[PDB]
Amino acid sequence: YTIAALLSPYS
Amino acid sequence: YTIAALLSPYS
Amino acid sequence: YTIAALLSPYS
Amino acid sequence: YTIAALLSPYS
Amino acid sequence: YTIAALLSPYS
Amino acid sequence: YTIAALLSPYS
Amino acid sequence: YTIAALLSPYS
Amino acid sequence: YTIAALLSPYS
Amino acid sequence: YTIAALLSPYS
Amino acid sequence: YTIAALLSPYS
Amino acid sequence: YTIAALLSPYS
Amino acid sequence: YTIAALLSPYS
Amino acid sequence: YTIAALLSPYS
Amino acid sequence: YTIAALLSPYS
Amino acid sequence: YTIAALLSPYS
Amino acid sequence: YTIAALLSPYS
């Protein structure tokens, strides 16, 4: 499989 | 805020 | 978060 | 009275 | 506060 | 009588 | 007999 | 993906 | 002369 | 607040 | 959540 | 002066 | 398959 | 915060 | 010939 | 996964 995810959650 | 991201996932 | 407050109370 | 204040808060 | 008073009572 | 007084109170 | 088969199964 | 295969089976 | 005064100023 | 005062000034 | 507070401020 | 304040901020 | 799960998350 | 999650992924 | 086989595969 | 197979090939 192939997966690429980016998450930069700030408060 | 400042965010820069690149993702080229291939199978 | 981001906060900026100024208070100069005089009697 | 005399007061001078500057605030540039960025997120 | 700010107060200024003058009194010169004579008899 | 003679009286002379000046008062300039600022806040 | 003669047989030729190729299989490259990926997940 | 990338696959290259050749098969020439003769009887 | 006769004088009587009471003052209880609170902040 | 609570205040109680009595004054009977005579001449 | 659970909160219980009582305040009786008098002047 | 008289002041009473309660604050229970949760995340 | 067989799965059994219970979750009671409170704030 | 409050979070509850269950995941039982099988192949 | 004689053959007898039973298979009950469950997931 | 779940797999069940039987093969009795005779000549």
UniProtKB/Swiss-Prot annotation, chains A, B, C, D, E, F, G, H, I, J, K, L, M, N, O, P:
Homotetramer. Dimer of dimers. In the homotetramer, subunits assemble around a central channel that can accommodate two ligand molecules. Interacts with RBP4. It is found in: Secreted. It comes from Rattus norvegicus. This protein binds retinol-binding protein at levels similar to, and the thyroid hormones at levels much higher than, the human protein. Tetramer dissociation and partial unfolding leads to the formation of aggregates and amyloid fibrils. Small molecules that occupy at least one of the thyroid hormone binding sites stabilize the tetramer, and thereby stabilize the native state and protect against misfolding and the formation of amyloid fibrils. Thyroid hormone-binding protein. Probably transports thyroxine from the bloodstream to the brain. Detected in serum and cerebrospinal fluid (at protein level). Highly expressed in the choroid plexus. Detected at lower levels in the liver. The lineage of its organism: Eukaryota, Metazoa, Chordata, Craniata, Vertebrata. Belongs to the transthyretin family. This is Transthyretin.
